[model samples]
Target: TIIPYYLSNLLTNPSNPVVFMDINLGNNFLGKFKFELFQNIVPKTSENFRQFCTGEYKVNNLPVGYKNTIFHRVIKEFMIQGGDFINHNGSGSLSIYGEKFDDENFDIKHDKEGLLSMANSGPNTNGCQFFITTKKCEWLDGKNVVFGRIIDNDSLLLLKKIENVSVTPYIYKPKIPINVVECGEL
Candidate 1:
């Protein structure tokens, strides 16, 4: 006999409960911002993120996350990378994630800007290479985990202030910090 419930009907599925956030970001050049999350795409990761938001996912049992992390990599008009080791200032890889079910059936379009996509190496080698798009990226369709998008004004502003970002590029947040404020299903 088969299980009564369908796979698509699971809690983590596309139409299932999803969480969203409204945040104020202090990014490079003291920019202010806000953003939302697509909790549906990365449910497991989202839980940990919520913990990070409430300043709970720390040294107690998990590794203390990077607070006031810097943008280590930039691809002008494309994206900015961060959320790795607060010091190393690198990208976030999905390989570091336990089980990333990249269900194409979830079929979320890569049309997400500020959407949090998992940074993977090859097929499922996400370690620490995640970035936020400055614009809609069509090339990233089957290449990255398209989880959520930026719905906050400050997030969009911070993403806008990139100079020499594509050439000998760089991004820095001296006074602003990307704080995880909250996460949960709606």
Candidate 2:
């Protein structure tokens, strides 16, 4: 028998209930944005992320997380990428399942804006880094694994702030640090 996508995502595939990530941009006093991950939709990838968020796992012996890390890359009309717990710079990796693991499910498309996805070197290289699309990235469909989306309006507004931040060159380092002060889910 076949099950509906939403129902499968809600009841079949799984881990923790709802994983929330609280991003704190050091520059903006009120820049804390919270978003949730769909662990059921992409179990391995999502579980890896959730583990990192709760400090239950580590990268290079250091707890995998977003804290002290900056929005390493940001582009207008594109996406904002971060989550480098190691190196703190944009160049970091975490081996949750392995230093790299096979892509779980790339079923989620970039049909809508604010889609959150894992960032990788090519395919299956998912580490502790991920990105959030500010606009539809059709180009990313069937490529990166989209694990979640911004659920609240306040968070959506903050997402815009992150997407439009002033940046440096290549890595697109934000002029003002956008730190992930804390991350976890209840």
Candidate 3:
């Protein structure tokens, strides 16, 4: 017999929780972007992101959230990756749970742009790192867990600006720093 994985209480529908991130390009304020977490489909993953946004969790006396974090890796027509709040770079990561957490499930597919997905070294190694897809990435459907998506038109435009930013040749690190100056649940 199959057990019901997603019970009614665990689902958040009709009004999935929203969050916001105020971005900054170097010293200039870019704009704010909004996202709707898919708590209905991916409760655990979405909660992890939500808590980070609200900075309700902490590590070593420091709040673990996306504030003052930079988009460490950005590839045009691909994705913009960040959430490394510790080192503010791709080399370090920490989850609200601990160093890492298991993948919630591959229920959501990366079929469109502006999707938020966890970035991990491999299976069951999810940490704080996540990426926003700049284009359809069907190849990542089963690998990365898509937990949320950009919900505002202005946010979409901001994402476009980030996607087109100049980057280092091979690594695709944005030349101008793209920082999440502020973030919190809406």
Candidate 4:
């Protein structure tokens, strides 16, 4: 008989996520955004994530949907929201994850400028969307899916590396512009 043991500390007991994951966009124009997905916690999204990372999306020139939409409604040093592709399918839908999953064990909390979290409308609504916190959002505890923890300066880091196209919004057309060069398992 073989006993089971966990090699990674995914959304489980007493394990702080140490590894950093990100979606790179510096190579979008060059057509080389290699995504490395973290499979243990976000396996479902990983499949889709890897498609972009492994050159599958680029090969077909599948733009990262409206994935890079910005945080329109912002609290400024608090939280922001964006990623609603219902209005922009030409950009592809915001990447989403499976429903019916739990993050009760996602004990770790959010921090200033921490690019962490999975986008969701409610329970089981996570998809091709996510958010970054400029300040810790204690009120959001256990409500959203804690799939990947962001390493600080990730978004900005990518910003410096890319040519950002900023614009204003029209409910008919989202204003926040994003160009995800790549995304995958870190």
Q: What TM-score does candidate 2 reach?
A: 0.83
Model 1 lDDT at residue 31: 45
TM for every model, in the order presented, reads 0.60, 0.83, 0.90, 0.47
TM-score ranking of the models: 3, 2, 1, 4
Q: In model 1, which regions exceed 4 Å deviation? A: 1-29, 58-63, 86-106, 163-186
List the lowest-lDDT window of 10 residues for candidate 2: 7-16
RMSD (Cα, Å) for all candidates, in order, is: 9.1, 5.7, 7.2, 9.0
Per-candidate local distance difference test: 0.49, 0.73, 0.85, 0.41
User: Candidate 3 on 55-171: residue-level lDDT in tens?
Assistant: 988676766788888898989878999988878868787776778888999988888888999999989878888999999999887888999988767889999998888889988
Between candidates 1 and 2, the TM-score winner: 2
Sort the candidates on lDDT, descending order.
3, 2, 1, 4
Ranking 1 against 2 by lDDT, winner = 2
In angstroms, the error of model 3 at 13 is: 3.6
lDDT by residue (1-186, candidate 1, tens digit) is 677844234333345333333333443233433334455656654444443333444333565443444455556666766656434545343222332334322355668566666565566544434567777787877777665555446556656754123334244532344443333333
Give the deviation of candidate 2 from the true structure as CA RMSD: 5.7
